[PDB]
Every structure is written in structure tokens, then in C-alpha cells.
Design a protein around this nucleic acid. Structure first.
Ligand SMILES: [Mg+2]
Ligand SMILES: [Mg+2]
Ligand SMILES: [Mg+2]
Ligand SMILES: [Mg+2]
Ligand SMILES: [Mg+2]
Ligand SMILES: [Mg+2]
Ligand SMILES: [Mg+2]
Ligand SMILES: [Mg+2]
Ligand SMILES: [Mg+2]
Ligand SMILES: [Mg+2]
Ligand SMILES: [Mg+2]
Ligand SMILES: [Mg+2]
Ligand SMILES: [Mg+2]
Lengths: 190, 134, 352, 199, 113, 107
RNA sequence: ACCAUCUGUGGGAUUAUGACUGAACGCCUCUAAGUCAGAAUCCCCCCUAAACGUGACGAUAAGCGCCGCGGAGCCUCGGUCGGCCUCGGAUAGCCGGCGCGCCGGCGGGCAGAGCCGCUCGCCUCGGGACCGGAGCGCGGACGAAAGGGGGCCGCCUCUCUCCCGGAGCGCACCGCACGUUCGUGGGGAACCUGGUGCUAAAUCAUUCGUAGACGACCUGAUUC
RNA sequence: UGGCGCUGCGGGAUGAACCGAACGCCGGGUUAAGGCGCCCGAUGCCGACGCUCAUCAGACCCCAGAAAAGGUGUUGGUUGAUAUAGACAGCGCCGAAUCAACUAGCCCUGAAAAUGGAUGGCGCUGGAGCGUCGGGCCCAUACCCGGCCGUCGCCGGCGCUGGGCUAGGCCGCG
RNA sequence: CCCAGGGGUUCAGGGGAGUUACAGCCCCCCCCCAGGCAGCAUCGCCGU
């Protein structure tokens, strides 16, 4: 079974100006610009309408494995839309029982030095991705703030910090110490 | 990105097969592979035909669904498919390719002599503009 | 059929074949990685193993049972007279490896350096580089040489330097010096060629190549032991005394299948005179040769800040089987490969 | 006289099956840019296929066993050799007519390279299937000359583009000359348009 | 070389002419098996061929060959009639002067003569 | 040039048998069976050079020798043809040039 | 002689696994497309060897090397029978022209289904051209991944070249094969010619013992 | 009962027995079984329809490694059950189908042995994989036609002579 | 040439604005099997 046509329309706000160069989607908003290539999906992209622009993702003669990549295109561009308008604010939370986790941000939010994790003398230096800025959260004790335009870069920078604070040779169900992701939000809250 | 689609009334060019070189109108789509084409004004009666031997053209006639040959012929003549195709560069490159294959030895000699002097006149004009520009 | 008691093998398969080294002078097979940030410098130097002795120093490693204690450490004396630069070679990186593009020799080349270009120097007319040296004076040769210097700066990515030892300053019988390419790891190619051009027919001391408290590598050929049995070549177990037809062999040289003796099986052959490269040889002292300071030749390269005895590095009766060390020398911790008076190619460490 | 083929975009066995047939017919083939040759299947498949090839060695003496060449040119050369009777004088003569090169060396940089449509990835493989490059496969098995080849191919495309831009101006000059001398070649362009030479 | 076919002789051989004034090919016989006939025809219905041009006329007389005065007279008798009608076809004077050869890419199985 | 380029692709064979009295030629422009009909009956020639001089018809002796043949039928569907020569082609000619003459003509 | 002493090393893709984004399947999901971390394994560096693999460079003996398409000849070995002197690449898009746009072309005619070269000579029309073309010619730019041309702008000599129409001569060898090229080809030993260039090494014996079963290897071997 | 042994030949990479076919010496033609990416003769068809991605893929008689049991991989089918008096999933909102069981293809898990190695090899993934088929093509010492040799059979022929009839010879036919 | 003259019915891969209207499709009747041209020519088979 191959579906003749499988489409999906994406709404684009007026503050975002989008340009299509083949399959390379480029969005530009108040928070910057983004650019993600989709030449590995092998679909059709089209911008309809001058005002109130939309993004039409078409798939002709695709099986179930190929129809699944249609919404993945749309959900990625929508992340690129809210990344240049609202941004992404991933919040970390350092959980500890006895030894407090000392986090010092260096290189203007491009490096996180994790100290005093489980009382270990080794220092954990986690470098953030390009365009991702880390900052010790205010109005909270052991909370971090990761900001950026690309969700795949901010959420990956959060996984680097979280997997860095991993307990070895212990009952992880008992030693629940580490810096975990507590909230996945946006920089601008509307 | 696509401009030519397979639809009811799409005039297609048969690249190979028993009716290679003729135009047909896609009157119905049987399955993903085959269609029901019919060229009333070209000499291809109504029959099933695969899409691999078709080449979509920029001509779409307004024929109803599963209408008989009397009405498929009207839209073919209403849209002047044969007139627009004969003046299109697609057919003119086909006509030029057919004439080049029918060239005799005397025709090639006339082309050899014509192209020999035509290139030498253009080649000198290119040298003339290069000397002028400098 | 498995061996009941496990045991490691009797050698390293990474030093095969155990043949005589095809060359006598050690070969630097890998120079340090070129870094354009650091200043211009050489990364190799030829030396001659004079002999061994021991020193007394106070170790200063915190946390050791030997901290702040006197130790007697064996050291090796390597007499390294200054080398004369007589050539520049430019290398272009090709998909088939580095390739020698240009080779510019100096205008004047000593007779001890030309001895390397001959097998019978005594009965041969000293004709080497006689027609080439004229290029440095002819206006046609100068222009051709300037095109060769520009070809190195434009096309070459690895600039090496040909240098030779001064065997007149050694107590050795050999007068034929040893030539060697010493890679320059300083900076841009334009600066490496200019630096090497101004160093032509000019001596280079070991004090400029290496420094005090530096881990360097020692390359060269080991001591030839001749044909040796498997008991001495691979250090295998000696068969019991009652073993018929010999007891200093390997009992089983392989199973039935494969029906072939394996290359990993230890066999009898030639031991010693192998090319080796031992790393992390700390320089303990860079001594100065005999030099007249104020009319009197000073011999004080074996005095320390706590000894003050006016004595030279040469012991009583000189280094046995070598001679007298009258030039600049290096002092490496421990032993180095080769016999006495063995030419050693000192190299900077490839590691940080 | 020499069939110069560009290896970029071609499949390993699809191209080797054709090059091996041309050299047997007494034709000299030169395959350039062997690092650009594609192989069907994901990269981890073809990498394991070569790592399993590295294990095939004579247990008693590996210096006699299968020689595992790492260069993409010698990888494609061994693929063509497998489809030739290289143990006969006829097959050895066929190997002498084939010359493989990593990248496009100066002997063939200034040439027009052929393309085999029966071996291209776009024609023989689905757009959704996984493939692997021979340049990356070789780099991860011991090919030490990938970075130097990439930089030399990078400069080769700079001088090839400056020549193409000059070639575009010559075409612009030729098309402009046809309009400025159309009155003098009107009798000649009618002969070519009559016999289908032009249109 | 390209020649003009005149008449078939009783022994099947073809009476072939250049003419001589174009490509230096006199009136001589030619087998049809060793001849490629093109699609170009000139109207020589008005050309009068003498009756004495038989196979014995072109039979080799069997010590150096020399063209006799009868061969030259029969040549000018036929050439004087072919040249006026060849000139009516443009670019045919040089087409008969030219020689035929296969170049790169020209395949006889697809070439139309 | 008055002959077509052909390659001596090999003898008429199976897999474990070889009939050297029939050769398989590959014409440079014929890549289909429907195109081999034009060459049926054309003279084939294996021109080569040797050491000793041999008589030349209509000329002076030289080192050039030749083995004449003729295209007899088609072979397969890829434009191959079969040819029989007065002497079986030597195995050294495999992959070399065979001149396919334009005579006996049928056009 | 661990019975003394010294030294023993860097990366890359990734396995297991834990994850990111994210569908399929309004949710969820490490997976489907796409990403991340990732190891005594694997590959590589380091390290040992160095191929019927090789680069640069030195010196090259009455002999010998370059330079007179040496100038003519004798033996031998193979092909072969017009060139293409070049973008990068995309494949759910591409190419060309013009200052992110606009215009133009796409079953590729700015096209390899292509382009280019291609009258049997030798003299004559001047009808079309200003094709100013042709060099055993002299200079100058451009080449290093396995270095450039049968090419280029320049200066120079002579009397040119292509297309379309006329007038003239040629062994026209009498139907017949190996014709038509690359070719003034690649390799021999010997020739006779005129310009220029230089005049060395290896080996044996001997010696050294940093070396060796024997060869091999490291060395020294005349007037400073 | 056939076959091997007593038997070569084409095919199964290979091999006493399998498949095809049995054999004087040759030419032309046509096939069998089996094949037609290259080795290696033949699909260099603009073959047809689907199935299948395998970090141990798979690749065909004998025949030269797999099972029980599993998979929300994918594709079919079967039998039921909810739903525009508004279900399934997600927090009354949402607004179109959805869910369950079972079965069958391919792939996957189950699946560990010792020198380095075996769809025969190379390699193949818009197929050179599996299933269903079409057209064309490839060659056996088989079949057809033709030549030659020998054997065998002719209620064979000829004593009725340019040649002929050593009749134990000669000639003809199958 | 909706073949023309009387008309009936019918759905939808629903044209025009739900059943022909600004396309068509199908099933049926009574009028010279209306005539006219082709005849296995998109699909088979076989010759004295
Ligand atoms: Mg525990
Ligand atoms: Mg000395
Ligand atoms: Mg005993
Ligand atoms: Mg994973
Ligand atoms: Mg990673
Ligand atoms: Mg028996
Ligand atoms: Mg029997
Ligand atoms: Mg088998
Ligand atoms: Mg036969
Ligand atoms: Mg086979
Ligand atoms: Mg289970
Ligand atoms: Mg399995
Ligand atoms: Mg018979």
C-alpha cells in the first residue's frame, strides 16, 4: 500500500520570514536565524500565500515508513519557528543528598564546570553547543538555565550535563544525585 | 516543485512502445503503474498503458471522467493540441532529430561544407570582438 | 590439547624480523608534529655514545620515600660536537606520501662531509659537488638557485635541513662524517626556508637543539651479538639436562596443523645490531667542550655547584674503548642503545 | 583511446563489472576519484565487511596472506581484479589497461571524464536506501591520505572553476558573434536547420 | 571515391564513370557487390552511351599499360554530356571530387546513403 | 577508413568447451541484435605484422599479414556477431582489432 | 644476571549501553528520517621490516654526454587507422544571462542522442572575407598530486586560408585483398658528418672490529 | 525399478550414483537439463507485478547447519467489537473512525568452536534478493541435414565384354 | 452525423449550480437489425 498524497500544512506567524532553497528551510525571527536541511527526507516543500504564509509538506507515493517523515518535517520547522520567536529555556535542577553540586559557568555560558558531585575531586567540564548559553538561575538554589534558538542544540546540551553527573557502581535508585532537566519551556512566555 | 502531474486530460508523449512518438490523453488512472489513455486525433485508440512509457507534456484538455471518444476528441481539438505541439520546441527537436537521421552522404557533404564556413566566420567574429575590447 | 598452564610468549612480535639493521646510522622515522606557533628550531641532532658513569643528585619529588635524598643514578655520556648545515630539502605532501621536491646544498662542503659521498675516498679524485658549487657564483646558477628557494616557499610543506658531524673533533678512527636530514618545526614555510638559508655552512650546537631537563628519544642500532640460539635470542626455557640432541632449543616449533612453522614460533638466527628507538631519556647535563677562555684551556665540565673540583668528564684513563671527550656532550639518565663510539641520533619526544 | 571515468557517484560492483569488461576488449580505462565511489548498504555494514576482510590472513606467515590495501583506488582495483582471470596472461593484460587513482591527478585533471549511468547511485539505488562512501571506509581502515587528497581536490576544483568561468565567457562571446554575423551566415544556418543539424 | 552509374553490362558488371574531368575516374567496369549505392540520382536519360562499350572493350589486353586514343575519345564523348547536367545540381561537382571514409562515431548500420 | 572497428571478443564457446573454428566479434557501433543484420556477410580481416616479409597483392612485399573471414550470423542480444575465418584466429588476437569491410555490399 | 640498571606512548569511527529531537499512533516513544555521549574490542599513530614500488640530488672514465627532425642505411618489437584543451554537483529539481531578485531554457539543441576536424592534387573567376593565414622560425606570461602546450598574447620573415560559380593540365594502370594513420614510431651494433661540453667511480687485495659462521656491514689508506 | 561398477559427454563451482543425454571422424543448424552483472558463451529487454533492510541479510533438486517459541519490523488475510444519541488517544473539551483477537509472507530474535575463508569467486540492495510470469538469447559426443570411415543387413547387382570381373573381385542400397 | 424522430430511468471518481443545468456516465423501449466503413484491423486461433 502506497498513499497517493500525504500532506500537512504549517502555520507561520507574520514576524517570521521563511525562505525555501530546495529542502533547506531558513527561518528568521526576532531572536536570530535558523537553517536546517531536509535533503534526506525526500519530500516536497512549498510556501503558499504572500500574507499569512504556510508551509505545505507533500509526500507522493510513500509507504508507512515514508509517511512518518511528513509530520517530522512539520514538527521540526515549528520548533524552528518558536526558536526564533520565543526561544527555548531548558531548566536544570541539581539534586543532591549530602554533597552540594557546585556549578560555575565560564566562557560566557559556553562551559559548565561541575564540582563536588558525590564528593568527587574530579572536575566535570561540560562545553555547551554553539548558540547555547548556560546560566545559574536566580530565585532558585540549584537551578540552571539553558537558552538558545535550536531545540536540538539546547536539549542536547542538557543531556551532556545530565549524563555527566552519573553515579557508577552504586544503586541509582538510592543515589539520586545529579543535575536533571526539570522544565522545558521558552525564553518568552506568551 | 512539480509542475506536470498525471491527471484526467493530461496530454502525454509516448517515448517507447507500439505507439512511440504519438500523443495520448490520460482519460483515467487504472492503478499506480497503468493508465487509460486515448489519442483520437493521433491514432492511439483507448487502451491501458503504463506510466514508464509516458512523458507528461504541458497540455491538459478538459475531458469528463470515462467519457467516450467523441468527447475526448472535442477537447483535443478545442485546446488545439496538435497545433500547439507542432509549434513546441519538444516536437521541433524531434523533427530536427528525425531529419538528421535521414541525411544521405550528399546531405552530410552539404552540411560539412556549410558548417565549415559557418564556424570560420563566427570564429573570426569572436577574434574581432576580442581585439576590439582590448 | 590446550596447554594446561598458561604462559606468555617469549618475545614481542612487533620487532620482526630480527635481522641486521640495513643501515648503521639510526633513522628518525617520525619527527615531532610541526607547530607554526613556537619559534624556529631543529628537532634532531647526531651524537656519539662515549661511555657510562654514575652521578649523585638530590631527588625532589614530593610524596616519595626517596624525596630529599641522595641517589646514585647511572648516566651515559654522549659526545656531541656541533654539526655543520650543508643542505636544505623541501617536501611536498602527495597522496602517496611526502616527496623530496628540491635539494639546495651549501656552496662550500668540507672534505669530511664529502667522504660520505664515496666508498674509496683515498683513491678517488675529490670531484663531488665541484660542478654544483659553481652555481652559487655563476649568474645563471644564482638565478636557478633563487627559483629553487622560491619553489620551497611556494610548493613545499615540510622543510628539512641536511647536517653532518665533525669527526675531526672525535678520537675515532673514522673520518667519514654522518649526514642526516633534520626537520625544521618552527613556523611558516617562508620563515623555515629563510632560517635554513642563513644557517647554511654554519655550525649548530646541541645547546640550541635540546635543553636541560628534557625528555628526548635515542635512536640507533643495538650491539651486534651475531648468530644466537633461541635460548639467548628469545629467552626460552632450557630443556632438561638429559635431553638428547641438544637442550638449548625450543622443543615444539608448532603443532601438526597448520603443517607449517609459524612466524610467531621462536627460531634461531641473528641477535643484536637491530634498529631501536627508546623514548623518555632525560638530559641531566649539557657539558661544554674544552675552550680557551683567558689563555688557559678549561676542563671543568664535570664540576657541580657542590663539588667545585677542576675535573673533566673523562675519567682516569679516558672512557674505555672510546677516547677523550673534548667537545660538548649530553648526559642522559640510564643506558642507551649501541656499543661505544656508536653514532646516535637524538630526537625530541613526539609526546607532550 | 582511453576511457576516463569519474568514480564519484558510482557503485563499487556496478562499475567494476563494466570496467572489467572493457579492459578484456582491449580498451584502456582510467578510473579517477575512487574515494567518491559509493557502496550500497549502511556504512557499518561495509565497514564490517572490510574488517572481516582484514582478518583473512595466513596464520603461519601474514606477509604471504591476503594483502589488504587501504587506498580507495587499490580497493576498487582489487574489486575489478576479482572479476578478471588475473592468473592468466589474458587477465593480466587486462589489468595493465586499467589505472585507478585517488582523486584526479594532473595527468587527467585537464580532461573530460565519462559517467556510467548503469553504475550510478541515483539510477541503481532507491533514494531511501543507505549507502557508504569508499573515501570514509578507507579512512577508517588505514588510508592515511584522505586529508591531503581532500585539500588537493579542493584546489583542483578552484582552478577547474576559473577555467569554466572563462569557458562561459567564450560561450557568451560565441553566442554574441552569431547575432553580429547572422547576415553573413544566413545561407549556412539554413542548410543546418534544413538537415536537422540545428533547430 | 564516388562515381556515376551509367549502365549494366551483359556480364552483370556496371559501367561506371567518374567522370574523369572531376575525380580522375574514366569509364570502367565495377562490380555491384563492391559498390555502395547512394540515394542521389542525376537524370542521365538524355545521355547517349555508344554501343561498342561492351565487356570485351574493358577486358584487359594482357608490357606497360597505356590509355589508347579510343578510350580518350569515348571518355570525352560521355563527359561532354554529363558535365552540363551535373552543374544543374549545386555542390555536386565537389561531392564527386570528394572521397568517402568512416570517421569517429559514423556507423554504416545506421548511416543512410 | 573504409572498414568498421571490431574487437575479437573470443571464440564460440560454452563454459568448459571452446570451438576455435568460430569467432565472436564485437562491432563498435552495434549494441543490439536488430542492428547486426547489416553486417551479415561482410568481409572480416585480422591484419597484423610479422617478422618475415610476405607478398602483397597490388603492391610491394612487407611485414603485413591478414586472415580473412566473414560475419555469418548474430550472437546474443547485445550486437555480437559470429565470424568464420579461413584459419582460426590466434589466441593473441583476443581484444585486438578486426576490420569489418563494407563489401559484399547489399545497399 | 629483575642477581645490577634504564625506557615502554597518541588519536579516530564506533560496540554494549544511556540519551536528544521526533513521528509512525492528536498522547507516548533513543529510531522510523536525523543527532549525542560512548569502551581492556576494532582501525590508526608510535614502533620493526622495506616491494619486478619509488623521489630529490651528487659525480659521471683516446673514450663519452648534449645539440644540426643527426643526413643517409642495416637488423628487430608492438599496437593502431581523426580530435574533444577539463566546473562543481543537484536528482522531491537543474542550467544560462543580467544587478537577494528578475528574465530565459528544460524529455537536457548553450544538447557526449553532442561538439570540433574533415574537395584527389597543381594553376586560374573575384562572386562572397579584412578567415591574414602559415613557421624544422626568435622572445614573454601560465605548470610541483605523477610540474604545461598540437596551446597562448607578443615581435618576425613569405604570399597565405576558407565557401559558392567558370577555364586548364595529371599514367585513366583496363571490376578485385594487406589501402587510408599515429610514423621523421619504440628498441638493438655499427656508420660515416659539425657545433658544444668534461676527463670519473665501483670492486679486489689490504686495513679497522662499532661487524661476522662464510658473504655482508662499520672504518683508514701519500706530502697542508 | 533405474543407475554406478563397465561410461565418456552438457549442467549441479567441485564430486563413481543426482538432472539432461549415452559416444565412429567432421561441417551447418536446433535444443535438452541448466543458464544469461563480471570471471564465463548468453537479457547492453527503456521485461511485468509485488515482497524484503538484515550491527550474524538472502540467493533455488541430490547438497553439504537449523528447531520449539517470539517481534507495536513490514505487508496481506480472517473473525469480531465500539463510533456524528459523538467513540479511540490526550487534557467536559477534542471531531473521525477506531479497537481486539487470530492467521499468513519476508525480515529479525532464539543462533556458541577452535589455521584465515567461502551464494564457487568478485560483488550485488530502482536487484546480481525471494515469489509469480513474458519475450529474447547461450551450448552437449543428444536431435535434424550433409561429407568421410567401418560394421551389419539386403531371398542386393554383375560370368551379357572408354572402363570392367585380383568373382577371396567389383558395384548398389538402408 | 449525441443519426434523427417520441421519450423513460438511474446512480456517482457529483460536471454546472444535488441528478444535466454552462461536462458527462449507466440501464431500458418503439421507428428502414437509421444508414454509411471497416472485420481478430485494444484483445485470439488456423490454413489444400
Ligand atoms: Mg557495592
Ligand atoms: Mg676521528
Ligand atoms: Mg637419552
Ligand atoms: Mg542506539
Ligand atoms: Mg559520537
Ligand atoms: Mg570391480
Ligand atoms: Mg551396461
Ligand atoms: Mg553444489
Ligand atoms: Mg554441432
Ligand atoms: Mg553460470
Ligand atoms: Mg522470549
Ligand atoms: Mg536468520
Ligand atoms: Mg544423417
Amino acid at each position: 500500500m502506497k498513499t497517493i498524497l500525504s500532506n500537512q500544512i504549517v502555520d507561520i506567524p507574520q514576524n517570521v520570514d521563511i525562505s525555501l532553497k530546495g529542502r533547506t528551510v531558513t527561518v528568521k525571527g526576532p531572536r536570530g536565524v535558523l537553517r536546517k536541511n531536509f535533503n534526506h527526507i525526500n519530500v516536497e516543500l512549498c510556501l503558499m500565500g504572500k500574507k499569512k504564509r504556510r508551509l505545505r509538506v507533500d509526500k507522493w507515493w510513500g509507504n508507512r515508513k515514508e509517511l512518518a517523515t511528513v509530520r517530522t518535517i512539520c514538527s521540526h520547522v515549528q520548533n524552528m519557528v518558536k526558536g526564533v520567536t520565543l526561544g527555548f529555556r531548558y531548566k536544570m535542577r541539581s539534586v543532591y543528598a549530602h554533597f552540594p553540586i557546585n556549578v560555575v559557568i565560564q566562557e560566557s555560558g559556553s562551559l559548565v564546570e561541575i564540582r563536588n558531585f558525590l564528593g568527587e575531586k574530579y572536575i566535570r567540564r561540560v562545553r555547551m553547543r554553539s548558540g547555547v548559553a548556560c546560566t545559574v538561575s536566580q530565585a532558585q538554589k540549584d537551578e540552571l538555565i539553558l537558552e538558545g534558538n535550536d531545540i536540538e542544540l539546547v536539549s542536547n546540551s542538557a543531556a551532556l550535563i545530565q549524563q555527566a553527573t552519573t553515579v557508577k557502581n552504586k544503586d541509582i535508585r538510592k543515589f539520586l544525585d545529579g543535575i536533571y532537566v526539570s522544565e522545558k519551556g521558552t525564553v518568552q512566555q506568551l | 516543485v512539480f509542475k506536470r502531474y498525471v491527471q484526467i486530460g493530461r496530454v502525454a508523449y509516448l517515448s517507447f512502445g507500439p505507439h512511440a512518438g504519438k500523443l495520448v490523453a490520460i482519460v483515467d488512472v487504472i492503478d499506480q503503474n497503468r493508465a487509460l489513455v486515448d489519442g483520437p486525433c493521433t491514432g492511439v485508440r483507448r487502451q491501458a498503458m503504463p506510466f514508464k512509457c509516458m512523458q507528461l507534456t504541458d497540455f491538459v484538455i478538459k475531458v469528463p471522467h470515462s467519457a467516450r471518444q467523441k468527447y475526448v476528441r472535442r477537447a483535443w481539438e478545442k485546446a488545439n493540441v496538435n497545433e500547439k505541439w507542432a509549434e513546441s520546441s519538444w516536437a521541433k527537436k524531434i523533427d530536427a532529430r528525425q531529419r538528421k537521421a535521414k541525411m544521405s552522404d550528399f546531405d552530410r557533404f552539404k552540411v560539412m561544407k556549410a558548417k565549415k564556413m559557418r564556424n570560420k566566420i563566427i570564429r573570426h567574429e569572436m577574434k574581432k570582438l576580442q581585439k576590439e575590447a582590448t | 590439547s590446550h596447554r594446561k598452564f598458561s604462559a606468555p610468549r617469549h618475545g614481542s612480535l612487533g620487532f620482526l624480523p630480527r635481522k641486521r639493521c640495513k643501515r648503521h646510522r639510526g633513522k628518525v622515522k617520525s619527527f615531532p608534529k610541526d607547530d607554526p606557533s613556537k619559534p624556529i628550531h631543529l628537532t634532531a641532532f647526531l651524537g656519539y655514545k662515549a661511555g657510562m658513569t654514575h652521578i649523585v643528585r638530590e631527588v625532589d619529588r614530593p610524596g616519595s620515600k626517596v624525596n630529599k635524598k641522595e641517589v646514585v643514578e647511572a648516566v651515559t655520556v654522549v659526545e656531541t660536537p656541533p654539526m655543520v648545515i650543508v643542505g636544505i630539502v623541501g617536501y611536498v605532501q602527495t597522496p602517496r606520501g611526502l616527496r623530496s621536491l628540491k635539494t639546495i646544498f651549501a656552496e662550500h662542503i668540507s672534505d669530511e662531509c664529502k667522504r660520505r659521498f664515496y666508498k674509496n675516498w683515498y683513491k678517488s679524485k675529490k670531484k663531488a659537488f665541484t660542478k654544483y658549487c659553481k652555481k652559487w657564483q655563476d649568474e645563471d646558477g644564482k638565478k636557478q638557485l633563487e627559483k629553487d628557494f622560491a619553489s620551497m616557499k611556494k610548493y613545499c610543506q615540510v622543510i628539512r635541513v641536511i647536517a653532518h658531524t665533525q669527526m675531526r673533533l672525535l678520537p675515532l678512527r673514522q673520518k667519514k662524517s654522518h649526514l642526516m636530514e633534520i626537520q625544521v618545526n618552527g613556523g611558516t614555510i617562508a620563515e623555515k626556508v629563510d632560517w635554513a638559508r642563513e644557517k647554511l655552512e654554519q655550525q649548530v650546537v646541541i645547546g640550541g637543539v635540546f635543553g636541560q631537563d628534557e625528555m628526548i628519544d635515542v635512536i640507533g642500532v643495538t650491539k651486534g651479538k651475531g648468530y644466537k640460539g633461541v635460548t639467548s635470542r628469545w629467552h626460552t626455557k632450557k630443556l632438561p639436562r638429559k635431553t638428547h640432541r641438544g637442550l638449548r632449543k625450543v622443543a615444539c616449533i608448532g603443532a601438526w596443523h597448520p603443517a607449517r612453522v609459524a612466524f610467531s614460533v621462536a627460531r634461531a638466527g641473528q641477535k643484536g645490531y637491530h634498529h631501536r628507538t627508546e623514548i623518555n631519556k632525560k638530559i641531566y647535563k649539557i657539558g661544554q667542550g674544552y675552550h680557551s677562555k683567558d689563555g688557559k684551556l678549561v676542563k671543568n665540565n664535570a664540576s657541580t655547584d657542590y663539588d667545585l673540583s677542576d675535573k673533566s668528564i673523562n675519567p682516569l684513563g679516558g672512557f674505555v674503548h672510546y677516547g677523550e671527550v673534548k667537545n660538548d656532550f649530553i648526559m642522559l639518565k640510564g643506558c642507551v642503545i649501541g656499543t661505544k663510539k656508536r653514532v646516535l641520533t637524538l630526537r625530541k619526544s613526539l609526546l607532550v | 583511446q582511453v576511457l576516463i571515468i569519474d568514480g564519484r557517484g558510482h557503485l563499487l560492483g556496478r562499475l567494476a563489472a563494466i570496467v572489467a569488461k572493457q579492459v578484456l576488449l582491449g580498451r584502456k580505462v582510467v578510473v579517477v576519484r575512487c574515494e567518491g565511489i559509493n557502496i550500497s548498504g549502511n556504512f557499518y555494514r561495509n565497514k564490517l565487511k572490510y574488517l572481516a576482510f582484514l582478518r583473512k590472513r595466513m596464520n603461519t606467515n601474514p606477509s604471504r596472506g591476503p594483502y589488504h590495501f587501504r587506498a580507495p583506488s587499490r580497493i576498487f582495483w582489487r574489486t575489478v581484479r576479482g572479476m578478471l582471470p588475473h592468473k592468466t596472461k589474458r587477465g593480466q593484460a587486462a589489468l595493465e589497461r586499467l589505472k585507478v587513482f585517488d582523486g584526479i591527478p594532473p595527468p587527467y585533471d585537464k580532461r573530460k571524464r565519462m559517467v556510467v549511468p548503469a553504475a550510478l547511485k541515483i539510477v541503481r539505488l532507491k533514494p531511501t536506501r543507505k549507502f557508504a562512501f569508499l573515501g570514509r571506509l578507507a579512512h577508517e581502515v588505514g588510508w592515511k591520505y584522505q586529508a591531503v587528497t581532500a585539500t588537493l581536490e579542493e584546489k583542483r576544483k578552484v582552478k577547474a572553476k576559473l577555467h569554466y568561468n572563462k569557458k562561459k565567457i567564450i560561450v557568451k562571446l560565441r553566442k554574441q558573434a552569431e547575432k553580429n554575423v547572422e547576415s553573413k551566415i544566413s545561407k549556412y544556418t539554413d542548410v543546418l536547420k534544413q538537415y536537422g543539424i540545428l533547430v | 571515391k564516388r562515381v556515376v552509374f551509367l549502365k549494366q553490362l551483359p556480364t552483370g558488371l556496371l559501367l561506371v564513370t567518374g567522370p574523369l574531368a572531376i575525380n580522375r575516374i574514366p569509364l570502367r567496369r565495377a562490380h555491384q557487390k563492391f559498390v555502395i549505392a547512394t540515394s542521389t540520382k542525376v537524370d542521365i536519360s538524355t545521355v547517349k552511351i555508344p554501343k561498342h562499350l561492351t565487356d570485351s572493350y574493358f577486358k584487359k589486353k594482357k608490357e606497360k599499360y597505356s590509355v589508347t586514343q579510343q578510350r580518350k575519345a569515348d571518355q570525352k564523348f560521355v563527359d561532354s554530356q554529363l558535365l552540363p547536367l551535373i552543374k544543374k545540381e549545386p555542390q555536386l561537382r565537389g561531392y564527386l571530387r570528394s572521397a568517402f571514409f568512416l570517421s569517429n562515431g559514423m556507423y554504416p548500420h545506421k548511416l543512410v546513403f | 577508413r573504409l572498414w568498421c572497428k571490431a574487437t575479437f571478443a573470443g571464440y564460440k564457446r560454452g563454459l568448459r568447451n571452446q570451438r576455435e573454428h568460430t569467432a565472436l566479434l564485437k562491432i563498435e557501433g552495434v549494441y543490439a541484435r536488430d542492428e547486426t543484420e547489416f553486417y551479415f556477410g561482410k568481409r572480416c580481416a585480422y591484419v597484423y605484422k610479422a617478422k618475415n616479409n610476405t607478398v602483397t597483392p597490388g603492391g610491394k612485399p612487407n611485414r603485413t599479414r591478414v586472415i580473412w573471414g566473414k560475419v555469418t550470423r548474430a550472437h546474443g542480444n547485445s550486437g555480437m556477431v559470429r565470424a568464420k575465418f579461413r584459419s582460426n584466429l590466434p589466441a593473441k588476437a583476443i581484444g585486438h582489432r578486426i576490420r569489418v569491410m563494407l563489401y559484399p555490399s547489399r545497399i
